Amino acid sequence: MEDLNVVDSINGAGSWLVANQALLLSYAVNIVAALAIIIVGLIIARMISNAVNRLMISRKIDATVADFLSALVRYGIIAFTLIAALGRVGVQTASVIAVLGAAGLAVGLALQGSLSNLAAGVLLVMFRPFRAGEYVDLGGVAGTVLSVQIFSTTMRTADGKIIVIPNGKIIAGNIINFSREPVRRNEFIIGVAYDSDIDQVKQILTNIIQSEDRILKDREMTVRLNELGASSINFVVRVWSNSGDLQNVYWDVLERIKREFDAAGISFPYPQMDVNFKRV
Amino acid sequence: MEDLNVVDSINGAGSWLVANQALLLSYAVNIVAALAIIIVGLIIARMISNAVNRLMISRKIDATVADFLSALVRYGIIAFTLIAALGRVGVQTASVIAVLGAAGLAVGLALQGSLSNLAAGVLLVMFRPFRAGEYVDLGGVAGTVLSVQIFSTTMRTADGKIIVIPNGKIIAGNIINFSREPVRRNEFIIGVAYDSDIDQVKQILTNIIQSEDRILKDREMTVRLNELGASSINFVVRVWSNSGDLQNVYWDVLERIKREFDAAGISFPYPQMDVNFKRV
Amino acid sequence: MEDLNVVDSINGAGSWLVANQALLLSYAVNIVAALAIIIVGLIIARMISNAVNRLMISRKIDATVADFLSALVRYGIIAFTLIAALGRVGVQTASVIAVLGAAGLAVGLALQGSLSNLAAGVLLVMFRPFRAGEYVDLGGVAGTVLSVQIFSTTMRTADGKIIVIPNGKIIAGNIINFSREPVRRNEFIIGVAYDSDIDQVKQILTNIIQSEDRILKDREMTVRLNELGASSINFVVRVWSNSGDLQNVYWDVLERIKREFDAAGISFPYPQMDVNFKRV
Amino acid sequence: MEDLNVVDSINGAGSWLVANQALLLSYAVNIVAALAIIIVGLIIARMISNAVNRLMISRKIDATVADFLSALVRYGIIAFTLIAALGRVGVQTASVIAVLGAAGLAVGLALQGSLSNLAAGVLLVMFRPFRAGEYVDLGGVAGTVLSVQIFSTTMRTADGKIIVIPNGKIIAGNIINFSREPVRRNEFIIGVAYDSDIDQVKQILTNIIQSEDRILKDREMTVRLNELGASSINFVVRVWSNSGDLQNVYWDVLERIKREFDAAGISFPYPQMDVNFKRV
Amino acid sequence: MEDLNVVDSINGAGSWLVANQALLLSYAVNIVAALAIIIVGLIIARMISNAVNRLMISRKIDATVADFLSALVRYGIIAFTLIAALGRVGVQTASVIAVLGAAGLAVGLALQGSLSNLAAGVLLVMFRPFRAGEYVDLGGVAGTVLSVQIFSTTMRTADGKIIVIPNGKIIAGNIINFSREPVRRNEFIIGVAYDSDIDQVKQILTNIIQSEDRILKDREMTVRLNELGASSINFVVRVWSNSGDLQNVYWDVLERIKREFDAAGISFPYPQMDVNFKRV
Amino acid sequence: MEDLNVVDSINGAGSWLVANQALLLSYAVNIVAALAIIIVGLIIARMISNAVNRLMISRKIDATVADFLSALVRYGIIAFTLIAALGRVGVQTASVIAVLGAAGLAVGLALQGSLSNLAAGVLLVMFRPFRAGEYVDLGGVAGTVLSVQIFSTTMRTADGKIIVIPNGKIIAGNIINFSREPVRRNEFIIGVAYDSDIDQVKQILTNIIQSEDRILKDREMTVRLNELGASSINFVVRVWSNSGDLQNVYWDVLERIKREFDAAGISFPYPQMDVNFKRV
Amino acid sequence: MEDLNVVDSINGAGSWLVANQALLLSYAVNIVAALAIIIVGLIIARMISNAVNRLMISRKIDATVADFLSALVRYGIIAFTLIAALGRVGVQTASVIAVLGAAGLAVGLALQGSLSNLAAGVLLVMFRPFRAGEYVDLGGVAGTVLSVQIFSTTMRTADGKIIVIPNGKIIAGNIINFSREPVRRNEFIIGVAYDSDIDQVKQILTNIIQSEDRILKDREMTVRLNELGASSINFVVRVWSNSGDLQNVYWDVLERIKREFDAAGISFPYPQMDVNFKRV
């Protein structure tokens, strides 16, 4: 029992190697496994770091951002290696992994702003509330869609502007649509003076909305007195047309109204006001 | 004791195999179990990845999204396999699973935006605050419902537009309804000049709302002076009718009012203003 | 020592079965317990799945939703069985249960939108801020309550509309009430011209509010000049009445005011304006 | 060694009972402890369930809610018993308690809406920002408090309405008060014409606010030209009075102003406007 | 070996007490330690409960709230004792402490509403953005501070009202101040007619702001044409004065302006309007 | 057995060193490992603290902030060392690391406000919704971008002001753009009197928009009556031009309109009003 | 074997001390280590409490707050000591540390309101979006900065008021600046009558903006008809100047405009209105 005579006291049948080689070899495999973990983590960090820098230099990137992310991944793998080795050698790594988990939860609550956009993009792809050429209205901005991507949706406004809008923002609102339904409805409102005959007005409006051709006849065509107003009675007029003709139908019916009324004698009224004069 | 004479020092009755075969076999089963876990995880990842790609190619999908999700599931199973093998061989995997849990919590807080819509859809299906043809009002947008799905509700507005609205957004508001109650109430407001006799006005309005037929008589029929205003006294008129007749009753009573008043002599007043003239 | 001679090397007194049967039997009970867990979880999943599908087919449900939830419960029990068996056989299931807990927290943060409504319904039931027939005002919508349920409250608006409103939304606002207090107060506001005598006006208003009978006399009855205005001085009038008579008292007093003032000579004024004329 | 000869192979000095009775008895105490846990949890669930149903049937409750909560508590204790027994017998219950903790966190984030009200009620009780009869203003609603409870505060508005307002909502706003300070200040604003003498106006207003008696004299009494306006110069008037006299002081001073000005010659001006006439 | 012959089967050299007294004594110390924990927790709960009820009966409290909190603390210590004893005897208490932690997190997310106010009060005490007599403006409410406490800040409004405002609400806004800076600036705006000479106006305003004495002369004194308006050109006037004189300087300069302009001939203009007359 | 005779009682074959040297050496390696951890953590804290202070003194920093962060890192490493040593010696460090994790989660929820900006900056760099010279509109503020950094985006407003805007704020809104699309559209609105001939107006506007050269002819050119208004009928005019010419095209067409209309006879109308005169 | 004969039954070769001294000494070191932990925690709590009270009495503090925080730290260390001792003696401290972690998370979610301000202050120091004397605009409040501290930013408004604004509030908004860019742009808007010649107006404005000297000539100088309005056509005028001259340039150009136009004959128009007279 050489190690028994080298340093430790005998104290009588104290053959500590025969009953301690298990623990000694446990320490040995601990330090050797620590070495192996360190060296393997080192070489794997090098390999994966250069590999990601390569496979990122191909696609559109920035140089400083590339170096930043590559070194970030390198240091992350290095930190995992170091923590694993510390745990393997005997140090209670509970605190370092507790603060590591706190930091990870922080990063997650940070990325939450964009992971939502990614998920919403996936859902808009799989459910298809609209296609590329579809003319839509996403939360107050209306214009022909141009493309749907993973993080955002590009749509050209009717004035030529190009709006990039994030997906997570539109999936949480009313996705109105305009090319889904083929036939839609216009709504004129024609305030006239209070002395105008109602029969004549309704006759004129019915003749006008009958003479038209893009106006669908197999549906409702309303010409009713809708409201007694401050200076004028308002007539509502509702007619249906295809999604294509809508605006031109509006303009044509509107100019025909402007001509027919002035031909008949019906008068659009200026804002009226009654004054009671009294000198002082 | 061959292994005793090969490398390790004797130190006297140091028969380390006889008292260490347990730990040696523990290491052996550790590495073998690691092998088995790796190979089984590999083949299971392959099988399940091709199976999900198949069973997704049937339904409506996108090719790149299909590949993305299939490879995602493959790599997820691979990562679980790798972590399990690391833990089985002896590496403290606490840190890697801590950051994994952080990432999972991040993904959960991301999907929270749509899981809510899914749950709200389930609840609207099971409780039925409205059916398909039901004409409803969900948070400021009113129109005939068309369908109720897992993630959204489609309803055709009265103008033909088709609004897709998420479920989680309507279950958190007042779900007004219009075809639930069969009989509803109109409310006219008729401002008249300040010199008009009140008895004559109430007589006329009562005659009008008695002559009608779609007006339910077994309920309240109110014609009362409601408010002394800036240029006119306002009369409120409340009558009940079935949900179908409502709008036509409104229009008919309104035109009858417009005719009867002008027949009698009652005058709707223009906005009045009194001026005190004084030259300078 | 048969197993000693079959495969493993002797190395001298290496009787590995005599000192390893404990670990061998540990492995044996591990695999057998895994088998038992799998089979028991299978049969229990089948039984409970068919039982829940039965006990749900009775109440009002949807077929696809029934199948969805039944298969969901089946797969949940199956997953718990599989994880338990993996843990029992020797695989470190820490990562799979970490991501499982992340998913569970996600589902909880999702259901948070409706669990709140459930709890608020419980509280409104146990505390009773209003009963069925009680006429209330819950956050800007006023109308007779119809029923109080676990998830929502139905109340018929004064116009016949039926509003379904979630509980969690009303318990976080001012629950005004109207049938709790038997006696309430009206408030007229009568702007008169600037030259009218104040004594005459207050005399007239006091005579009017004394002649009435539904007006409680044992409380305050206010007729005071309240404000010098742009074209008129405003008199406030406050009187008390039972919750039933309130509106009819309002209408009757209002018409009596309109008659008495025009009988006396007091004049409600049109919006006045003084102009300084100067030709150019 | 009977059990040695019954089933297990000898393999030489393989006396597995002598060296395995510890583990056998461990299994035995495991299953027996499982039995004891199950039976004790059963009887305790029964006892506590009937006890809570009894002690809840006394106070104001609902029958279905009583049964719901009693069965809820029963099943909760049963689930805890089952999980404890599973853990005691050898099944890794990590996953079931992980999802249980997820569900518990969900329920907590749900109850968060009302636990806050409970805590705020405790704080309003212990700090006393107002008492029962105190006339307060809690976030835009002003009226005499009636009672303060654990979850809400009842206050009768000045119009007789009874508002129930949650505690957690008022502790997060400005708790204005009106009976805390005994003496408060009024503020008149008297726009007069642009040609009126300032000395005469200030003399009149000072005489008026000196003749009064409820107006505290030992404090500031302001009559200053405050603003040159569009059609009138505005005088501010600030006087102090006890919290009781405030409104009557306001009304009396206001009528005295209306009388004194018309006696003197000062003129309240109608909205003025200068027009430049030009024929076309 | 008495216990060997009493119940358990011999099976040959099965001396189970000699090799099981360790586990038997483990069970013994388990049950005895459980007893000790229960009794000690009981007596400590009694002592601490009566002690807290005593030391709370001194300060201002409510009786029912005192009993509530004392029994709450008692039951909390009792629950901790019970859980500790269960864990000590052998029951896996993981689930009960999981739901306990869920409940604790719920209570924490509840108290979050007031812990913030406590912390903000600490910070306002240690940093002193204002003192007791300091006249401040905390988020739209301006008035002399009266006291700063742990949970709220009391400040008497300029009208005598006493506002209690929570600390956590003011530390998250702009803490304007008025007695910190000794000298401040007024700003008049004097719209005059469009035909008035600019030199005369600037001369008059400069004479006025030079004649004053509380107006600091060593700083800027601005009289510039600031804006061409709808009916008048506006002159800005900026002068500096001590925080005390500010309001009286304003009133005095304003009345001096009103007198000097009317003495000179400059005319404040009524709202002008040009009309184009045309008979029909 | 010296240690057997020194202090501990014999009690018969109680050779406690021979059977306790394992535990004694466990204690020894515990205290020695604690020493090593303390000294290594000390020297590493010193080295890394001075190294970070050096490598931070180079870049732009503040002295007190440098010392603050260096001492912060030093104390952090010291605390981790202390906790590791406590765990290694035998103290249950569960509570200290629990509160440490609570503090870490607090710091993470604090930094969440800026980590989001960092991530959004990364995304704007990698996706490039705009470049340096690109003239954009980020959430209501429009102006030429100047640079894009890790935390903020600098853009010079059209008035010369320089706005620093955080990244996390713009990635959550509509990133409008103006130099992406080369050709855009103007929109004039020309209200004319009600008696003007429509044919003449449309002829004039068409001649004007044909005479121009920067107006793209291969696209739509709209001159339609768009709306009957209160005092005027409005004509819409839509023309396309390159992003460069847009504003000058607007100004030139506008002045040409102003000249051509006044040349023809078309009259822009003043706000009209009809008055009903009646003496009192 | 004395302890064998004292209390425990023999049962045959039941030498429980020889085979139980390990566990007895484990209990002994448990209780002794508990003692040591208690006494060391006591003395360390005393030392650190008096030390922090001393090192806080130096800097500006409050007495009651000092005692509060010192006793808080004392009791915190005492609680950690007690929990450590309980764990060391054998009590399962899982529940107490679970509720402790819940409380810690509560305190963290409380301090989150101010930790954010601290971090934002660090970032504003290190990035320097503005310096001390820099005149900035932070979220709607504009004025010369006075100092930047760890928790707040002090800036003197242009009227002398001193606003304390928290850092976390400004780092989340548009940090406009005014002394960063040396040269900025004014923008006049001069509505003139509809009959004024455009050539004369543009000539006059160009002469005016050429005669000036602080107006940078090497940049754009715009005088264009910008809008046809209700009663006037508006001319925009854009000129550049150094950040210093800006306001004086504005005032001087404005007065020069007012003089030159009135010299030429151009007329600023009063709000126009056309009336259609008709007697009744």
Ligand SMILES: CCCCCCCC/C=C/CCCCCCCC(=O)O[C@@H](COC(=O)CCCCCCCCCCCCCCC)COP(=O)([O-])OCC[N+](C)(C)C
């Ligand atoms: C999405 C899911 C991703 C999951 C990622 C990975 C998925 C890939 C899965 C891979 C699982 C298969 C790999 C083998 C398992 C490791 C063997 C082992 O642990 O040895 C251990 C013992 O166990 C034994 O010694 C005997 C075990 C025989 C294994 C062969 C039967 C597999 C039973 C299949 C059962 C159903 C499997 C269902 C599969 C679908 C080593 O000895 P020990 O130290 O005493 O062990 C401690 C045990 N203890 C903790 C209880 C104390």
Ligand SMILES: CCCCCCCCCCCCCCCC
């Ligand atoms: C008994 C063998 C395994 C012992 C180690 C288990 C460590 C588990 C750590 C889990 C950490 C989860 C952090 C989640 C953060 C959101």
Ligand SMILES: CCCCCCCCCCCCCCCC
């Ligand atoms: C006793 C055998 C199992 C010991 C290991 C159990 C580890 C459990 C880890 C649970 C981690 C949950 C993280 C949740 C994050 C949202």
